[model samples]
Target: DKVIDVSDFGAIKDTGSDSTHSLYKALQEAKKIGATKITFPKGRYDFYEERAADRLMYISNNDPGIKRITFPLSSFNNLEIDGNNSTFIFHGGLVPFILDESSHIVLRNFSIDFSRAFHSEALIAGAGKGYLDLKFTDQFPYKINEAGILKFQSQLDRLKRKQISQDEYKYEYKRVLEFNFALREPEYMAQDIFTGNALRAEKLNVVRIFHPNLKAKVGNILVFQAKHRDYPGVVISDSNNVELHNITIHHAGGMGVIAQRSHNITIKDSKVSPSKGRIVSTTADATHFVNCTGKIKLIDNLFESQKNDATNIHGVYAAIDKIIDDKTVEIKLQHPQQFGFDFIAPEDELELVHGASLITYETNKVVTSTRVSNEVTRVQFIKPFDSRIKEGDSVSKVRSYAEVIIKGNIIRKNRARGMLLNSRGKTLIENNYFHTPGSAILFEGDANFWFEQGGVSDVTIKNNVFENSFYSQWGKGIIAVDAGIDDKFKETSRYNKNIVIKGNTFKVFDKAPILNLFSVSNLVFENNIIEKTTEYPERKKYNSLFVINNSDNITISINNILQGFSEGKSQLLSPTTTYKR
Candidate 1:
């Protein structure tokens, strides 16, 4: 057995020579040399596709000890056959694996492109369907709007403000998913609102509300997952100690990259813009990055989607049941780019139903998004439609939006939010520019400005710009979601203590600066500007300020606060609730 180079081993290199001839010649040479590293340099090299029970690249189960291998790429069309334009495929399994978990595998500087010339169906659907041929949606249910079968939804309601057992809330969530508004059409669910196999009719939209204190069980799931044959992207499975750098993984029938049950993996400085949402799925733990994962990081790279129903940022089971280092895992939602809600399948045709909320027993179905976290600062936020839309409200007829704008001296908006902290830890909201909206920031987490899991202690809303705000008929700007979804005070028991509202500029939206919260204690209001807009434009409705309730200890002192309410009327007044020891 002698190592044979393609040219030396009678392999043709002309424009007419088929790729298989060249690749096989090369592989034969690699095997002869007992090579662990196979290098394919720059060139437009076409190759044969995979056929039944065959693979494009094959390794006879090498030792686990053989930890690393690097495959270079100019471009690729692996296992592509011409007779039926199908049949050739690439399959390999390392033999006699020897290395421990620290086995090093690195893939770098490779531009691996899968040929778009051939169309293949779901070649691997596990047991059910052998593999459906790649066909256009010209058929029956094939092209009809897929309700909720294939979807991924976001889970951003991190801290629990509402409490209900799994059974109760799950029923509620079910009702919401059955809404005629969603079922009337066939639409693809967005990443934040859809998850797990095409949810069966009775199984979709079932949310069992769980707190950090609960012991949850995950079961009876029929994981329906399929990847198109000859799909361009990369799939790393059942391995460890892997590193892929300075490469671009884009244009695939599935995920840009899927790493399952693997650990200590690093995918950095790489750009992945698959028409599908998310660049990669780190289904396991120990993943590192120097500004990797997700799209937009590929600013200079060329990745585009011709169709409108494409979303770039979506993370599903990827973040579930895993411990993350703050620095290691950072999910950035970068707006201001060309990405709008275009990725959503049209509204009229969407059929997926958001399931039941196990606790609330309310069907909380949202068709568009689920990543509705309190961390958004610079994006436009639209309030819930059913809760605020009403007659005489022209803007309500139009879509309402919220954006996080921060101007250094114009009025700094900080870390204020609407999260229910289990610990009454002090929360410091700083460095922000909050444009006046119907409502802005809110908080319900640990009152102390630190990270903990327990009853809230103290909440501090400071260093923010409250320019132009309105409580609206629906309440706005630093409102607490802690009041249960309906403000019935069902979720909250302990009065919010040691509250401090300072160093913020609040220009009157309709009246003077205001604060409206329930069951607050040991409160302090100081060093802030409360000015009413002059020549107040006459509107039918009136807005006011200085609203407080259910408190124990209170202190109010401020500098540079301007008010413009008439004598009998008051904008600079505080509402008081009786409190005695």
Candidate 2:
């Protein structure tokens, strides 16, 4: 079957063999007659469509030194790099397929489209002793979210709870806390409580860093976030024993497969849609950075980003002296409700101690935006400070960090503050499910809401489920803690810092304010279940039984079952634990 039809496979390296430089001049004339291995049949190679046709067809010189190119079973269709307003256009964006130092290259295809508009960066392979088999499937605007949610102390906790107006604080409080709060409650308490003002004099410290926004409205309020300005469509570099299966990318404003400096990579059954930017250093100014090392694997994907980057944790800026080791990295992201991935670091670069890691799957599936035609009553899905940097040295930047874990899952209608942690490390907020809409988790910068380095001791919030997201402004259910000043500097007759609101279940609606504590200290609001509804119109007035301001030794009873309507007053506040009556 010597069809040899590259226009008779001769000197026609390109110029004439039309159909857009005919199969790249038949793979450069079957590798200049050495015919290592080239095959492409399954129609539609409009390759460079439009009358100015011919001449250049890539692969310039002649240095196939090691030689080996096999594209056996193929189908490269309607290869439109944007001409006549293509319908299904894919492949080629400045860098499309280049695995020099070639060793046994295999490119199996079903569909590969870069659908060029121009922000190019695709497939640049380089293997020394290689054996590569690349199969990329159905690539379109599937969804490529560059994940960015750097809400620095959540608009300084809405400008210290003033709710918009330091001249409208950067167009309505940083776009309503970046799309109705995915997490940002840095309300410094008493303006930095001990001086870290305006994020340490504009070092971009975040977590309600206080000050500066005076009236410039919002000119520069980013102390750290270097990469993820947006623009993502599969970027895999350096190259090594690479394997990316069943690949799927949708509307990439950034990152689907971005592995810099590369080595031993494996990305399986991929699907990234609107996961809203940021895996590391890419705020999209044009995306650049080169260096990453060994064994990186991302398995089972279906991440749709609505917008996320809840303040610091290596969320951007990669190539940290070659991160050497990382294993079992799985992200079980659940829908676009808000934040399922954000690992920040880059208040200005260089300072990520302890190798930087995360072993996922316990929580991730909350990212919102689709109320359409406008509903906006409230939707602060998640955020109120969760900083975990654990020691910085961006050349004397002085950064310490914490934030361990918040388990279980299913956090439905969030409005503001759910699962928050602020440096001290060691938090495992167990079994979650805080339905309804607004405030489920709020434990700020000091340790103990989820974990960091053990200080709020054995902090384990058991089997969770706080229905009707704490009707706040006043009426509440879930939680609100302010355990300030209890590292044993003394002062405890109440609110002593060590709370455990046990096994929850508060399904009430006539207002709902199950538990509320202010000041903080040794607290344990046990068991839990305050359900009671006959469509409850009203009968319960505040206090589901515990309201202690100034706080101290607290221990509210066992098994606990309060089937609705109860707040008939009297439950004295504070003095040294023991309540059980």
Candidate 3:
């Protein structure tokens, strides 16, 4: 391969100018070359959205995008980007990279970050009865509403680059996700009414929020996750066989890496976390996959301090709109955040899932796929639909969702769950370390509300450490299983099957991290050790060790249950023990 140095294209380091144009031009030149490998210099390269390329992309599980991308690598084959120990700094609200309809691509060895972070922050000044004082740094710009409510705005320069209308693009008025100074844990009172209408500034950059209930106290630095997810670190859409290696993403307005309708992605030796001064990194997940196929491998990565989960792998559950014929149906992408991305293609295998029970009833191959509207798709199946398929049922691309392998990663202290697992693939999760605020592993499937897909089967969870996890009130389990079914006890077939949990360590405090395992069958739990610690006082609702509901074909065994709080005391688990509620 011909090694193309970016310096040859005037992309100079320490130039004190926007490198967006130079980098883009270099990549465009490389695309013209039949055989090429692009390499960058070893320093900081700055980028601004003003000179960037724009694309109308509809992302999955994020805000709809008229995306401003710094490096648009589309329709390229066998491309390799070797960022030689460099940091690509971006301004506000523009994606760093996009791999669209590209295959056999390799991106390695770089860091991506914002010059000044997009999300706002405030220091808790003081608090009294229903009144809390806040102080903001000069960097964080804000305005007061008519009622003196503190609202943060986007960088005006970021919006100036767009051709959107005034009403179409507006400032964000809400603090969507907030975190304390210590990104070490979750906040219980976050959702318990620290009301929205509480801000009234006594002085500029100093707001005294007047509300009846106050949970934040003085000296605590609060980080607000941006409400809008217009820009992510890297996005892969309608692409295949991509590999990312040795990349460090310090901050992004959206997720670190979110891929949709792609296949065979491997990310290794990467890190997604806060930079030196900030606590929040990506506003959403560190890595997310939607309707991807082949293999999704996450290895030797450090994912921490994101506002959302470290990883989420799922498909879109398109709701049935109209039965056009015996083999033709119009499907609606129900969620406002997820639409316009055609997940189905001709010859792709699909399954009809009951919306309520989440059970697979029928299977067929797509004969044709056409977009009837932005939110609706017309699909013709090779075989006639089963009689059990209804108007409210869902169509999922069963053969297009990838098998997942999560290994050798350290996932620590993120908001919500550590990993949201929803797939009908063979999943192997092993040798990972977790110290998260929510469930370390969450199996969640929803069609009616989230429109995210599920029907997980053939999963193996082994040789992992759950060290003092599920510490937050929102946690369902250290390992949880949940669904969007209306009646969980309806005597219907279960949603997931063939799950094995073995050779793991569960280090816990008061909270029960392993509960809400529902609508699953063929579960095997064996050779795991449970250790109790006085990390926190036991304030919990359930006392049973295992809470299983509406499931069968269960088997379990324990190695030991050590009493960690009583001076390292230990005991053998009774032989009559069972893993049930």
Candidate 4:
């Protein structure tokens, strides 16, 4: 295959000049020349946002705005872009790459870093009864408004000084996080800490945050995330058969990678971590998949030090606004984070999930769908209404899911949970290592809040290592499977079903709960080793090793489980089973 070198198109390496236009020109030249491979010569390439391609995007689970993208690869097929182990440094407001409406695409061997991080990190100087003092560096410039809310500014924001300076124009603080500098591995003290009542620029680099019960032990670091999540490291939209290999994303304004309404995505041997001077990497999750189909695989990836979950895969659950006819309904998107996409399509299998119970009472198939608005869609079903189904019910698309395989990944030190999974397809999470602060693995389904996909049908979590990952999250558990279904409603059938957890190692700390479950059925957990660790002292006195009240058909606690904690004579097969040996 003939390779097109980007250096021939004036994308010179190590120039310290903006290569935005050169990179775009190279992509255009490749398309014009009908080249299958585009290679970037070795060395560093810098990209700025001034001349980059800007598009008004509405990405799900990310802040929607005018995102400036560096390499816009769309409407093509069978293209491979090899970076030659090059380092691509970028400025603010630039998503490095976007693949849309394409197939069989591969991007490999590139590392992305930002000159200035999207989030600001400050060192604590002093703390007292009702206030905490902090010191900042010029690396992250900021100012507190009259309302006492701190707003982080970018190099472009300071230069343009926009006339319409809203959150889309200016970088506002989304939340604050705590980090302990005492730890050698650079761990988080508290993720998403609330900066209290007011803030003050007391001196040049010193500031005071006033609050009654703020937890700031002097010398810790506080990370301030931006409210605007306009930029992601890469985006795959409406594309098929996409693969990213050996990609290192050191910083991104939003998620490291966001794929929406796509198909068959694979990311292997990539890393999402912070750069040299910062603790936060991406502003949100490391990677997110919304309404994707086919297969989604993450193999041998390192996703750590990010702001949110390492991997979140789910589909949108639109609400039924009104019944148009016996076979049609008007559905609307309720969440602010998700919109502007086809929520339902023709011949798509869907489930009518109750808003309160989240139970899939019956399933329906779509006949046709027409978007009346960005948030409202008119849909026609194959059959008439169930007559019991009413307005405000959730319309969950069951066919818009992929077989998710998360294998051989290190998920650690991120905000929120390690994996937030709500897929309806077959999911296999195995051979992974986790040392996170929150629940290392979470399978959550909801309709009342967050509005992620509802109910998990089939999932297997086996052969993983959880090394004291159940330390925080308010004593949730190492593995939490929950739904926003109402516990008050009695159900003949549960919301989640057919989950198998086997052959994993859990290094429990403080005797925290190992499994927290609700509204689940046919769950099996067996042959897992449990070892006690003193990495952190006993924080809370949990009730038992597993807390699962509203579930049934649970086959757990074989002979080896008794040897771990030494029940001595017998084994308990259920979490709700009470026994004494």
Candidate 5:
């Protein structure tokens, strides 16, 4: 465990210096000397060549030579990268700190500011702040929406339908902004920016994009993003045993921290937030775990203002193309070479998901899949399904025995579901605070609920506080469970079982139900308090305690205490033996 100072390798503390090569040299030296610690003094370490003239830098991951540095594992064990309260400014292009095929590395005590590196391009109007002309350049036509929002036409349709919110618009907006018109291929069109009044001009030619925040001399519509869509704060791919602490990643184009096929990774005392300037927004989850099979622990972290879920953990699954019979369904594999007993075997549980409907386990039968062919696998259910399984429904392997613990964190101001548990098996969500999220906690089979890869089973949610976390469109249930449909599985003991919701407090600032349980079995809702903080006439009239639908063995005991909902103003608890739909 040797200590190597980066400054010794011509790494200066100047803010304007291109210290990429210097730090790269230092890392090489550390590996050469078999060092465990690479320390950086308190100073600004700026890397990158120059600012983009057109305010657009498209960095490609296909070319490894353009990245900041690629750390290839070569006897590099127990390494600690000590940033020492220094700021690392990256700008040149697609500069990512890649930890490829390495492990036991600790990156901490550092702050990253990418504000200076990537500049957001704004779409300015005429000189007099009048009509902003955006010629639909390529084959992919663009226009402004009737709402005066500069977005894709198809995207505006979804927004107009209330299918997505303004916050969710950022995700689609990022795509529209990142469209590469030079390619002549509409593949980069995130969404269509249709034309409108504020965007008054030509439809097929000089399309005017308009907004309320338009400026005369200054650019109004920010139309640019990082070249790398997967521009994470840090990417740990094909590596393991990594730890991150006291690190702050600001203004990422995509995820803050992305772990792909890595395990035993620990991230604590870190802050991942979007940039103050909302020109080019971050895409989704603050932290993402993809196909990871080891113990992943995220504790005491502050994740705020993210476009999507704060955290998501799940694995990849193939798609089910057709239902051959009641107990067997046909699946299409992405890779034909992957067909083998090692890839998938009998008794491996999976959840069938519908793509558009956002329903997980639409057919309630617990699945046991087997490889029937190299191209198509046959999934046999535990029971015969009565309903026809849709063609576009997806299939993902359920890691039923995987363990996860989410505790002692502040998850706030996210667009959608705050805590979404999809994985089956032991999960403990306790002692956390969720504020102003769409839904506080969603226990369902829906992968689209929280972008989770799996569904929930055997979960214990206790002692958590929900503040103003209710979506009126989706019943705003502080605790919602989609529990799967019962037509396929006659027995209620199959999935979404053994769930306990107790000892939690909900502050209902909006009109929504305390709990909405759908097709859940062996469920317990007890000792919970739901208090209405504000007095709205419509909200008070609509707010209810609990709505239990199509669930059995349910015990609602000593719960349903109202704070602001006056007597006869709100329904305490609404119970129905049948499904509302």
Candidate 6:
């Protein structure tokens, strides 16, 4: 490979100036020279300083055009990025790297430090000064009815005063202050400004004040809070044959890595986590792959304290046009090639996704027939609708020759699910460790949030360890697989096939089951250990190791041990355990 050093061009080391322009110049030169590899010397490449000036760049979801520079990976092949212990510092304008339509690319050995991200600040008192007015760079882009949270630090002495009432004191301690973005003036400096940390429209109205007593000072910090967007550490879209290794992404405001409409992507030996300071939360997945027909392999990664799942792999999706009774619906493809069942056949299973709620359910029958058209495809279901579904719902055909492998990862201290496998085929999940998670591994036929959108098949869950799952008390199981149907709609029997669970250990800390098999077939739960102990060890719901509901062909053979169950506990296999409410 022809190697090009970024320093050979104008990119200086640790100059506190934006190196994105210099880096772009180097890539342009490398393209002209046909250099397939680029090296970054050890330095701090600050792209955020210059890029943050484009205030419109902070708009979430829309791709911020290469204000921060782009690699345009589709333009090259056989490329390798060797970051020699370099650190890319971003204060958050756009994503640092864009791998678009690129193949045979390797990005390794770099660190992204999100020291201070966009709109990530809090209000603090400044030397007892009052009411500091900060002008917007431009007028607020939102409508008059738009509302958001405002955070501030209150003075301790103010709460103790006789002038402050007990009701006002209780409201100040609340974490958030909800207010409208519209500008309004309080004609008379009245003390009854707001109510209960939320601006009230009844008597008084103000744009930015949290409380009548609370005012911004000269040195006080005011942060406009908004939800983080899809600004990931690295974004790979419309590309293939990509590998990322030995990279450290810190304080990711959005997600760590996102692969969309691409395939053959591999990420190994990388660390993704929220930055320690104010940027301590990534709003979504550490690693997410969506609507891509390709094989994805995630191995040897450390995902620590992410706001969303550590890793997510899914397929292309389409929206339902209208719900025609319970068993039938109309669908329009977001793309002509995408029907969620492109990889799987029409005779195979499909997943029904509620577009608004993101709840998913497996269809009881496959596409028995379809009234096909250029714009819409009306699919008929074999069974009556179990759940109430409305128009604009969606479905996905699960895998097509694309396999997923998740192995040797440490997922810890995450706020939401650890891993979600939806409707992918030929998956291997082994040797992973999860702790204090909401749900460890979820294999469902339906979609929850951004996780699943189809049925799962040919999955092997072996040699993985789960601890303290279901701590939130809202999970279905520690390691769960459900037919893409909702709990409310349970009349039909739509199950996934060919699942094997062996050599896995689950320690549930809450009232959730270790393994929940709902609407599944040809499942073998053998050689798995479940350790659970409760005061009421005799209770069937508490002591049962596995919950089998609406499923068939399940073989619970030897070595499926359950600890701390009372004598004459309800039969080891509970056949009557259905998910219906």
Highest TM-score: give the candidate number. Answer: 4
Give one digit per residue, the lDDT tens place, for model 3 in 66-131.
878888988999989999879888866688889999999999999998876766667877878876
lDDT of 5 by residue, 459-547 (tens): 89898888766533322467776533444442342346688888888877655566777656787878777777762223444344566
Off by over 4 Å in 4: 144-149, 155-170, 184-191, 195-198, 490-493, 561-581
lDDT of 5: 0.56
TM-scores of the candidates in the order shown: 0.30, 0.22, 0.91, 0.93, 0.67, 0.68
- Deviation in angstroms for 11 in model 3? 1.1
Ranking by lDDT: 4, 3, 6, 5, 2, 1
Q: What is the model-wide C-alpha lDDT for candidate 3?
A: 0.77
Off by over 4 Å in 6: 49-74, 118-226, 276-281, 322-401, 445-452, 482-491, 532-543, 563-581
Residue 354: error of model 3 in Å?
1.3
Candidate 5 residue-pair clash tally: 15
Q: For model 3, what is the error of residue 19's alpha carbon versus the real structure, in angstroms, after optimal superposition?
A: 0.8
Give the least accurate 10-residue stretch of model 3, judged by summed lDDT: 569-578
lDDT of 1: 0.29
Each prediction's Cα lDDT score? Answer: 0.29, 0.31, 0.77, 0.79, 0.56, 0.58
Tell me the lDDT of model 1 at 372.
Answer: 34
TM-score result, candidate 1: 0.30
Task: Report the error of model 3 at residue 148, Å.
Answer: 2.3
Clashes (N, CA, C under 3 Å) per candidate: 119, 90, 2, 0, 15, 15
- Compute the lDDT of residue 293 as modeled in candidate 6: 63
Q: Is candidate 3 or candidate 4 better by TM-score?
A: 4
lDDT of 6 by residue, 271-384 (tens): 875554332345457887775666788899988755567776666456667777677777665542222322323575666656543445555565565647544667776676
Task: Give the C-alpha lDDT of model 2.
Answer: 0.31
